[PDB]
């Protein structure tokens, strides 16, 4: 996260850390949507261009964390993956379209003050909140500058941006399964996601029932917090049907 700040304890109870067994290192961010399922970005698991292709036994899931590097004994919970599901039509070859993946935890995780799931959006909620100008929240332990990193989980509040403005800012073929966020050059404020924040949650709080809903997934950008550029996120709702499908079947 760039131009963000230290999250407070229990602020993002759904924030998950994808941890690599060997070498032991931060891999990506992810989110808890129930006691057996965590949602993340596909490019975190599969990305041929960089020879990235992890499997169940290569990873560990750490839930309930705040600190980036310490083993928060008695607080965080480490879990093993049982199955990884990459969206069948995930396009890593061209524009990272449908950048989404589901991980099935081996054993259910017990909730607590620091471990709690985030809601997935319904057609109505998404329709009311996913509007240009409306601010959302992003969290992660990723880099703080484009090219030292955070000691503690970071967070930023960014505005959703008009689809047209998103398009005219890149040569990458934008699709309907993705939206962009960030401040515009003259808006005075800045901030963005960055390497290391991938798979992390983009959430919004419903003014109707006060719940937090994950609208997006940290996917891609061009550099970090560059003026004229914006971060892109996977449109959770547009892929909500693939999500449900996976869970009831498996």
């Amino acid at each position: 996260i760039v131009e963000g700040s230290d999250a407070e304890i229990g602020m993002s109870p759904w924030q998950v850390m994808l941890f690599r067994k060997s070498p032991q290192e931060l891999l990506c961010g992810a989110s808890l949507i129930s006691d057996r399922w965590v949602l993340t970005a596909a490019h975190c698991l599969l990305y041929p261009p960089w020879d990235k292709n992890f499997t169940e036994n290569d990873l560990l899931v750490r839930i309930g964390k705040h600190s980036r590097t310490r083993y928060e004994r008695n607080i965080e919970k480490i879990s093993m993956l049982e199955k990884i599901y990459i969206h069948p039509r995930y396009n890593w070859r061209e524009n990272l379209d449908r950048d989404i993946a589901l991980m099935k935890l081996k054993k259910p995780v017990a909730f607590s003050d620091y471990i709690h799931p985030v809601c997935l959006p319904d057609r109505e909620t998404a329709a009311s909140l996913l509007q240009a100008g409306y601010k959302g929240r992003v969290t992660g332990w990723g880099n703080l500058k484009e090219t030292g990193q955070p000691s503690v989980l970071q967070v930023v509040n960014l505005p959703i941006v008009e689809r047209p403005v998103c398009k005219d800012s890149t040569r990458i073929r934008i699709t309907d399964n993705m939206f962009c966020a960030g401040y515009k050059p003259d808006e005075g404020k800045r901030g963005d996601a960055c390497e290391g924040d991938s798979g992390g949650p983009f959430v919004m709080k419903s003014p109707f029932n006060n719940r937090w809903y994950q609208m997006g997934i940290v996917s891609w950008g061009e550099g970090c917090d560059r003026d004229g550029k914006y971060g892109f996120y996977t449109h959770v709702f547009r892929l909500k049907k693939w999500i449900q499908k996976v869970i009831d079947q498996f």
Binding site: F19, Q24, E25, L26, L60, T69, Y71, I78, M80
Partner: peptide
């Protein structure tokens, strides 16, 4: 990073 207990390396 601070090493994590080996009981979670399967």
């Amino acid at each position: 990073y601070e090493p994590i207990p080996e009981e979670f390396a399967q």
